Write an enzyme that holds these catalytic residues in place. Structure first.
Site, PDB file in Angstrom:
ATOM      1  N   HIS A  62      42.377  39.260  39.909  1.00 22.27           N
ATOM      2  CA  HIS A  62      41.441  39.046  41.011  1.00 22.27           C
ATOM      3  C   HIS A  62      40.124  39.726  40.614  1.00 22.27           C
ATOM      4  O   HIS A  62      39.736  40.721  41.213  1.00 22.27           O
ATOM      5  CB  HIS A  62      42.030  39.661  42.287  1.00 22.27           C
ATOM      6  CG  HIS A  62      41.353  39.234  43.553  1.00 22.27           C
ATOM      7  ND1 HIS A  62      41.450  39.958  44.724  1.00 22.27           N
ATOM      8  CD2 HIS A  62      40.574  38.162  43.837  1.00 22.27           C
ATOM      9  CE1 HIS A  62      40.768  39.345  45.676  1.00 22.27           C
ATOM     10  NE2 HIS A  62      40.218  38.258  45.158  1.00 22.27           N
ATOM     11  N   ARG A 106      43.909  32.473  55.240  1.00 21.01           N
ATOM     12  CA  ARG A 106      45.197  32.692  54.588  1.00 21.01           C
ATOM     13  C   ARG A 106      46.107  33.479  55.529  1.00 21.01           C
ATOM     14  O   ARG A 106      45.664  34.442  56.166  1.00 21.01           O
ATOM     15  CB  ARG A 106      45.019  33.521  53.317  1.00 21.01           C
ATOM     16  CG  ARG A 106      44.638  32.753  52.063  1.00 21.01           C
ATOM     17  CD  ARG A 106      44.733  33.658  50.827  1.00 21.01           C
ATOM     18  NE  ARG A 106      43.770  34.762  50.862  1.00 21.01           N
ATOM     19  CZ  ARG A 106      44.068  36.037  51.119  1.00 21.01           C
ATOM     20  NH1 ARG A 106      45.319  36.413  51.366  1.00 21.01           N
ATOM     21  NH2 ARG A 106      43.100  36.950  51.128  1.00 21.01           N
ATOM     22  N   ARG A 117      33.201  30.188  55.567  1.00 16.47           N
ATOM     23  CA  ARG A 117      33.045  30.004  54.125  1.00 16.47           C
ATOM     24  C   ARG A 117      31.920  29.063  53.717  1.00 16.47           C
ATOM     25  O   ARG A 117      31.526  28.183  54.480  1.00 16.47           O
ATOM     26  CB  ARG A 117      34.355  29.454  53.532  1.00 16.47           C
ATOM     27  CG  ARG A 117      35.587  30.297  53.793  1.00 16.47           C
ATOM     28  CD  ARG A 117      35.631  31.500  52.877  1.00 16.47           C
ATOM     29  NE  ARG A 117      36.782  32.347  53.176  1.00 16.47           N
ATOM     30  CZ  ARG A 117      37.203  33.335  52.396  1.00 16.47           C
ATOM     31  NH1 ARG A 117      36.570  33.601  51.258  1.00 16.47           N
ATOM     32  NH2 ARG A 117      38.259  34.057  52.748  1.00 16.47           N
ATOM     33  N   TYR A 154      43.450  25.012  55.613  1.00 13.12           N
ATOM     34  CA  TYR A 154      42.400  25.996  55.342  1.00 13.12           C
ATOM     35  C   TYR A 154      42.467  26.649  53.972  1.00 13.12           C
ATOM     36  O   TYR A 154      43.507  27.194  53.580  1.00 13.12           O
ATOM     37  CB  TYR A 154      42.387  27.095  56.415  1.00 13.12           C
ATOM     38  CG  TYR A 154      41.069  27.831  56.478  1.00 13.12           C
ATOM     39  CD1 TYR A 154      40.090  27.452  57.397  1.00 13.12           C
ATOM     40  CD2 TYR A 154      40.787  28.885  55.605  1.00 13.12           C
ATOM     41  CE1 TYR A 154      38.865  28.102  57.457  1.00 13.12           C
ATOM     42  CE2 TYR A 154      39.553  29.544  55.651  1.00 13.12           C
ATOM     43  CZ  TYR A 154      38.603  29.148  56.589  1.00 13.12           C
ATOM     44  OH  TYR A 154      37.383  29.786  56.660  1.00 13.12           O
ATOM     45  N   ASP A 179      35.501  35.556  41.366  1.00  9.88           N
ATOM     46  CA  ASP A 179      36.795  35.723  42.054  1.00  9.88           C
ATOM     47  C   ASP A 179      38.008  35.916  41.134  1.00  9.88           C
ATOM     48  O   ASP A 179      38.812  36.825  41.352  1.00  9.88           O
ATOM     49  CB  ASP A 179      37.039  34.568  43.047  1.00  9.88           C
ATOM     50  CG  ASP A 179      38.121  34.889  44.081  1.00  9.88           C
ATOM     51  OD1 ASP A 179      38.125  35.992  44.659  1.00  9.88           O
ATOM     52  OD2 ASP A 179      38.976  34.025  44.337  1.00  9.88           O
ATOM     53  N   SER A 193      39.514  41.640  48.529  1.00  7.94           N
ATOM     54  CA  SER A 193      38.944  40.511  49.271  1.00  7.94           C
ATOM     55  C   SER A 193      37.948  40.972  50.336  1.00  7.94           C
ATOM     56  O   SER A 193      38.254  41.859  51.143  1.00  7.94           O
ATOM     57  CB  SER A 193      40.057  39.704  49.940  1.00  7.94           C
ATOM     58  OG  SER A 193      41.082  39.380  49.021  1.00  7.94           O
ATOM     59  N   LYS A 242      44.196  30.434  44.925  1.00 12.25           N
ATOM     60  CA  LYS A 242      45.022  31.634  44.885  1.00 12.25           C
ATOM     61  C   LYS A 242      46.440  31.334  44.404  1.00 12.25           C
ATOM     62  O   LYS A 242      47.024  32.106  43.628  1.00 12.25           O
ATOM     63  CB  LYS A 242      45.071  32.290  46.272  1.00 12.25           C
ATOM     64  CG  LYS A 242      43.710  32.725  46.828  1.00 12.25           C
ATOM     65  CD  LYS A 242      43.080  33.796  45.942  1.00 12.25           C
ATOM     66  CE  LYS A 242      41.824  34.357  46.552  1.00 12.25           C
ATOM     67  NZ  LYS A 242      41.222  35.381  45.659  1.00 12.25           N
ATOM     68  N   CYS A 245      34.549  42.500  49.901  1.00 12.26           N
ATOM     69  CA  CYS A 245      34.099  43.860  49.590  1.00 12.26           C
ATOM     70  C   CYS A 245      32.769  43.853  48.839  1.00 12.26           C
ATOM     71  O   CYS A 245      32.004  44.822  48.905  1.00 12.26           O
ATOM     72  CB  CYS A 245      35.157  44.606  48.776  1.00 12.26           C
ATOM     73  SG  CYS A 245      34.993  46.401  48.780  1.00 12.26           S
TER      74      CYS A 245
HETATM   75  O1  OAA Z   1      41.429  33.412  50.059  1.00 12.91           O
HETATM   76  C1  OAA Z   1      40.439  32.857  49.404  1.00 12.91           C
HETATM   77  O2  OAA Z   1      40.579  31.724  48.761  1.00 12.91           O
HETATM   78  C2  OAA Z   1      39.095  33.534  49.393  1.00 12.91           C
HETATM   79  C3  OAA Z   1      39.075  34.769  48.519  1.00 12.91           C
HETATM   80  O3  OAA Z   1      38.493  34.765  47.347  1.00 12.91           O
HETATM   81  C4  OAA Z   1      39.757  36.008  49.055  1.00 12.91           C
HETATM   82  O4  OAA Z   1      39.714  36.255  50.348  1.00 12.91           O
HETATM   83  O5  OAA Z   1      40.370  36.807  48.203  1.00 12.91           O
HETATM   84 MN    MN Z   2      39.387  36.474  46.176  1.00 13.44          MN
END
Ligand code: OAA
Ligand code: MN
Ligand code: MN
Ligand code: NA
Length: 606
Positions: free
Chosen positions: A255, A78, A396, A226, A302, A277, A235, A279
């Site tokens: 989250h 990201r 991943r 990606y 998540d 993210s 997200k 952790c």
């Molecule tokens: O960015 C994503 O899709 C993977 C994730 O759960 C994060 O890093 O918060």
């Molecule tokens: Mn996440």
């Protein structure tokens, strides 16, 4: 009329508004073919085999139906600096900072986005297939579920969406003439290719932009193939668009992991936890508890969508259909349940491959038999004492949630699961105790707002673990959370803050963690039950002397692990004050300022 170009499905069988979306963007993007996904097993297998022969993915021979993609090194995560939300007014998206630039989101004007869009999308799918992915976020029948339609030119996206969402023909039939989130994605490489193709991974980093237009119910993403940039349900939809729908409709998009925990007396509670993210969300959500008679089951790892019911219960669903977890650091000892999950039907991105055809990464904790060699994520031979990691730090796995051996039996219950506690947490090497409990709902909201975690030589703010994910003004989000206390008959969950990462004076972790975190969960369980197991401190309630089950742990340094310093907390509360003043400014709710003043006052008196 793009009918002549449809290679699977029919435009005529699409609901009116879905057809318009497909055809409108087909006119713009000029795909060679249109493939309406049915989500069938045959469609999936063929798609994968096609990627395999085009050098896009490799089959992993050690496993049952497992695949490996290696990306262009320019397209590996990201990118927040190219992620934006468009609204008429900037203030609706991000608070206006008092001093510097906003850390709480990135606004782009409608005019600027229109120019950006025109510079990217026209003709962008020439020579490629436009895949139409109908998908549901949440259990198909759920009142909390929401439907999207993603258009993409990437087969990698299609396969990953099948795993990460509920995808196919049954979603179309469920939708009918209902509302849906419009999701448009292109890797930005029309054929014939203008720029060199790297690692058979189509992408356009220079023009990468992922945009959200909440008022139009649209997500528009260009240039990256990606993960969070291309899997739009993840997200973009499940947090950014969804947090705004939730603001409007009176629910929450967070989250948060969701887990179910049962004690040795058959009593079960559901908990939600928000950690930044990378952790340890998957670790906690899938832990094997060390305490006898206890069991943990995973609902999600998540995202949580949560709505108070008519009885006043906070009902949560996991809107996702799979796990998109960070690969490095996953091991038999750290997360045995995740290992069992990823053995079949899984897509790996940017991890190493053994000569046996297996997966490898940093911290996998699996010694290899003599002879076995390793190929890195850069498609080169790799040695244990080499300069570079064998897997990308952000590599991943993408695996079906149903494959989790401890998947909760209510993980796709349409009504959701009743949340009784909410846990906030960060990585803090110093000052912050193992666990504390918020003094009230308002204090709890403040605790979430004040979250900080090390990233390792800088400590930065990540309120509610949502800093890269707020769909709207963070001040308004705080107000939204606080308003729950004024909803009639609402049963407000207890709020806790945890820190697994406190160190002593020479850098050693004070808490063993992993499965031993069940001990902290036990304490929360009892506190929810009303157990007289807590002691009042300036920062909240902590475990009483001997209240934690520490049997089998040896000599845990409880003095240091639960110590609270006036000197540390003076500095801390000062830091939070300046941060909230700057970043939230005029949109900071009264109650948050009040909680802050109260904390300052309690600290001054110790
Ligand atoms: O960015 C994503 O899709 C993977 C994730 O759960 C994060 O890093 O918060
Ligand atoms: Mn996440
Ligand atoms: Mn109030
Ligand atoms: Na590749």
């Amino acid at each position: 009329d793009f009918s002549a170009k449809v290679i699977q499905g029919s435009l005529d069988s699409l609901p009116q508004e879905v057809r318009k979306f497909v055809e409108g963007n087909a006119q713009l993007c000029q795909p060679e073919y249109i493939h309406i996904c049915d989500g069938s097993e045959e469609e999936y297998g063929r798609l994968l085999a096609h990627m395999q022969e085009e050098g896009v993915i490799r089959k992993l021979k050690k496993y049952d139906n497992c695949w490996l993609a290696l990306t262009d090194p320019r397209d590996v995560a990201r990118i927040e600096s190219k992620t934006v939300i468009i609204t008429q007014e900037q203030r609706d998206t991000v608070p206006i900072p008092k001093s510097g630039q906003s850390q709480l989101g990135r606004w782009m004007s409608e005019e600027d986005f229109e120019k950006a869009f025109n510079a990217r999308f026209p003709g962008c799918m020439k020579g490629r297939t436009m895949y139409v992915i109908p998908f549901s976020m949440g259990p198909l029948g759920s009142p909390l579920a929401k439907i999207g339609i993603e258009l993409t030119d990437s087969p990698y996206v299609v396969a990953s969406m099948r795993i990460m969402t509920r995808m196919g023909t049954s979603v179309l039939e469920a939708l009918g003439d209902g509302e849906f989130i419009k999701c448009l994605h292109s890797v930005g490489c029309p054929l014939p290719l203008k720029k060199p193709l790297v690692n058979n991974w189509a992408c356009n980093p220079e023009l990468t932009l992922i945009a959200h237009l909440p008022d139009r119910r649209e997500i528009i993403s260009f240039g990256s193939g990606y993960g969070g940039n291309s899997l739009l349900g993840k997200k973009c939809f499940a947090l950014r668009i969804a947090s705004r729908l939730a603001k409007e409709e009176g629910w929450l998009a967070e989250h948060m992991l969701i887990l179910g925990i049962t004690n040795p007396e058959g009593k079960k509670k559901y908990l939600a936890a928000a950690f930044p993210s990378a952790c340890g969300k998957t670790n906690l959500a899938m832990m094997n508890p060390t305490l006898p008679g206890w069991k943990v089951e995973c609902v999600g790892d998540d995202i949580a969508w949560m709505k108070f019911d008519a009885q006043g219960n906070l009902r949560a669903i996991n809107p996702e259909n799979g796990f998109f977890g960070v690969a490095p650091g996953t091991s038999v000892k750290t997360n045995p349940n995740a290992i069992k999950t990823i053995q079949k039907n899984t897509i790996f991105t940017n991890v190493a491959e053994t000569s046996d055809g297996g997966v490898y990464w940093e911290g996998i904790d699996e010694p290899l038999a003599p002879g076995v060699t390793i190929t890195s994520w850069k498609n080169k031979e790799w040695r244990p004492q080499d300069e570079e990691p064998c897997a990308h730090p952000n590599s991943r796995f993408c695996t079906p949630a149903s494959q989790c051996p401890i998947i909760d039996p209510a993980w796709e219950s349409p009504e959701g699961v009743p949340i009784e506690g909410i846990i906030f947490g960060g990585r803090r090497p110093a000052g912050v105790p193992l666990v504390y409990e918020a003094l009230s709902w308002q204090h709890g909201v403040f605790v979430g707002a004040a979250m900080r975690s090390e990233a390792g030589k800088v400590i930065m703010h990540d309120p509610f673990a949502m800093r890269p994910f707020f769909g709207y003004n963070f001040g308004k989000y705080l107000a939204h959370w606080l308003s729950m206390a004024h909803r009639p008959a609402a049963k407000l969950p207890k709020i806790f803050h945890v820190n697994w990462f406190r160190k002593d004076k020479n850098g050693k972790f004070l808490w063993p963690g992993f499965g031993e975190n069940s001990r902290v969960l036990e304490w929360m369980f009892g506190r929810i039950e009303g157990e007289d197991s807590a002691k009042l401190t300036p920062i909240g309630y902590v475990p009483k002397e001997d209240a934690l089950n520490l049997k089998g742990l040896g000599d845990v340094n409880v003095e240091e692990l639960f110590g609270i310093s006036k000197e540390f907390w003076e500095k801390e509360v000062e830091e939070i004050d300046k941060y909230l003043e700057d970043q939230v400014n005029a949109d900071l709710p009264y109650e948050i300022e009040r909680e802050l003043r109260a904390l300052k006052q309690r600290i001054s008196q110790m």
